[PDB]
Design a protein around this ligand. Structure first.
Ligand SMILES: COc1cccc(-c2cccc([C@]3(C)CC(=O)N(C)C(N)=N3)c2)c1
Ligand SMILES: COc1cccc(-c2cccc([C@]3(C)CC(=O)N(C)C(N)=N3)c2)c1
Lengths: 376, 376
């Protein structure tokens, strides 16, 4: 696994990507690692933002599936042509596989101008694969055609930024202390159940069933930690009041303006550590992950309307549930243990850390009626 | 007002715009009519998607305000340089005014590739103007510097598509029957209070306070009718079950895949009319607006992965409240009566109508405790 270490580039703002090769002979592309979707879609036409794109004409091994896909988002969309071809991951396992590729032929607000990636690798499960759950995801093909074990792990770092995708197992050099595991509630998204939240050290006497309304998921393709309204509403109230040494703008919390200081002058300690307790592997047992304010206030880089230490509030609202984005994942080594229906967390050997507090994964804790926190 | 009739172009998918002129001599630009924001922002650099952009260097009358703006959205952002200049609306009032312009110098996922507009005219109020409520919105400058009365009205049409912005008053040729008025609850967004909802004819025994959690607004710059989760959840359940002659995809309702038939074969009548009751002008009195399925199922045009009559579900979820978008507004002539803190609705003389049902604005109805439907 020394080969796979540090095989990711990019930020949480713009995503993390791994180099991939597609077709015979190998076309090299930079592809977003996205645990929030299940399609392997690559740009296959010269959209002007793209550095590279998939040229099927040049591949011995491509096969058209004579079938198209349309994938709308909030303001976004992409659209392509389903086929299959030979995929390999240079700095991954030393195998090669026949995976589905959606050749993106049209898109709106999908690719980022000035980004350095050209497709997405949806690592989530069949059930949310477009167009339907028979479009077998990449990772399933990988395990299903090779001797690669059914799990991968992710260490996302970054102050641009880097990280590691260890396909097939775990690499002990990427975390400290112990890995704790929460169940994958169902294999569609990487859905997990949050059972209690705390800010700094004090919870939120909130029906935990809210924390997971209607969903809680782990998504390397979402930037923020994203909370539902009631919990966000509740959350911010408590972070806001906690963080009243100083008075910041009332719309900033809603991510409608950003906030700024200068070099050195970022007020670390006015801000609370935040703690999510996740359902554990055993009845009535949980564990917790604790994020520093480094994680939920992320530098907004080159705003030319300043030369200051600006930051956006990396927590936000959701109609679709909790989303533990790259802001949360940057603190931890996250193991996606598809073989045992569980996701493991450990302190990342690369989390940004002051000489004061830290990120933490701790347990066990005793929590009753955890199964009641999942929405049905 | 014969001059202002039909001075809007575009769709609900891509927005409606009015021709404007800025600077001396007049630079012509196509600008989005957006009642969901309060900034007049125009593209002022040669972003490649843009047909035209504001060239300050060429204006006698421009004045720099030596101050910048940054405006983030969900995935989106823009950023510019505050100044003021001379603005006129060719097919508007025969005046000219000194308004604030944000010259957009940088943006991500803001402009649409293949769109024909180049800025936005935020018609909402100071309170949500970025950076703060002292950046006086266009319309306030308009009324405040001319004899133009403090109201405008909008007729949005469309099967591309058209419409009319009547600045300064009402034009009786754009609606049928009577105008009914709901209070502007507060002057930030165009916030209104929904007090009951019905599908086909049957309500939703839902605490009306949900319908407005935390906000209900009228937004010509939002495409969908957008409902909060509980109400959307509730809503769809009732539209879904109502519309079970046929079985459509389970993810389509969430706007994650679109749905299709062919010429002639759109099943009109399986789908219910929807009714929103809005708080009226008098204690315990309301009125209602009724939308046909034409309105909430909008053609998705050139999907090349078909030659069928496709449609997206024009209703969706929200962390930020109800939003009555261009899907709702297409049915009605909407009067923004800033002078009397109220918004008027009437059947649009241009709503798309089958030889069966219709859009409707009706009243009065007796509804108790309407003031309790507003979130505080
Ligand atoms: C940190 O990761 C990202 C940063 C910016 C954008 C994206 C991204 C771009 C395009 C599509 C996706 C998507 C496939 C769809 C989506 O909205 N989510 C939340 C997701 N998981 N992946 C992400 C990821
Ligand atoms: C039908 O109107 C539109 C269709 C597509 C896009 C837009 C649009 C594009 C860019 C910004 C806006 C914005 C300023 C921000 C926003 O998200 N909303 C909801 C809004 N009212 N206007 C709209 C409007």
């Amino acid at each position: 696994f020394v080969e796979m270490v540090d095989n990711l580039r990019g930020k949480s703002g713009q995503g993390y990507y791994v180099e991939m090769t597609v077709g015979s002979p190998p076309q090299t592309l930079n592809i977003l690692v996205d645990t929030g979707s299940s399609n392997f879609a690559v740009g296959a036409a010269p959209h002007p933002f793209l550095h590279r794109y998939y040229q099927r004409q040049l591949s011995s091994t491509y096969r058209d599936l004579r079938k198209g896909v349309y994938v709308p988002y909030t303001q976004g969309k992409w659209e392509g042509e389903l086929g299959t071809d030979l995929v390999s991951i240079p700095h991954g396992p030393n195998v090669t596989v026949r995976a589905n590729i959606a050749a993106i032929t049209e898109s709106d607000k999908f690719f980022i101008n000035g980004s350095n990636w050209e497709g997405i690798l949806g690592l989530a499960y069949a059930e949310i694969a477009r167009p339907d759950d028979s479009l077998e995801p990449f990772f399933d093909s990988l395990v299903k055609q090779t001797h690669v074990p059914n799990l991968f792990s992710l260490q996302l770092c970054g102050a641009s930024v880097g990280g590691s995708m260890i396909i097939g197992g775990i690499d002990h050099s990427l975390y400290t202390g112990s890995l704790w595991y929460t169940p994958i509630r169902r294999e569609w998204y990487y859905e997990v159940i949050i059972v209690r939240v705390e800010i700094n050290g004090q919870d939120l006497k909130m029906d935990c069933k809210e924390y997971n309304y209607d969903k809680s998921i782990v998504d390397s393709g979402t930037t923020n930690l994203r909370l539902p309204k009631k919990v966000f509403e509740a959350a911010v109230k408590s972070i806001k009041a906690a963080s009243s040494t100083e008075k910041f703008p009332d719309g900033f919390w809603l991510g409608e303006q950003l906030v700024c200081w200068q070099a050195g002058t970022t007020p670390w300690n006015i801000f609370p550590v935040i703690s999510l307790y996740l359902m554990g592997e055993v009845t009535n047992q949980s564990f917790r992950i604790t994020i520093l304010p480094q994680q939920y206030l992320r530098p907004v880089e080159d705003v030319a309307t300043s030369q200051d230490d600006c930051y956006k509030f990396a927590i936000s609202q959701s109609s679709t549930g909790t989303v533990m984005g790259a802001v949360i994942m940057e603190g931890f080594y996250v193991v996606f243990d598809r073989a045992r229906k569980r996701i493991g967390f450990a302190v990342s050997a690369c989390h940004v850390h002051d000489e004061f507090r830290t990120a933490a994964v701790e347990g066990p804790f005793v929590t009753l009626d955890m199964e009641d926190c999942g929405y049905n």
